[PDB]
Amino acid sequence: ETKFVQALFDFNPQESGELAFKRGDVITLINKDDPNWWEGQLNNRRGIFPSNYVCPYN
């Protein structure tokens, strides 16, 4: 099964390799082994983001 997470807030990246997103965007989960930094796919972009900035989606 493919997991999706909806962004609760905007995440403005401060380092390279971090997935930028806006509130309401839906990211496709790729990896979440790390309690704080998760990896996902938002459109043609892929990178890591703060786990606490999202929650599960449909």
Partner: peptide, 7 residues
């Protein structure tokens, strides 16, 4: 937003 953990 909530606190971004240490990178």
């Amino acid at each position: 937003p909530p606190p971004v953990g240490p990178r």
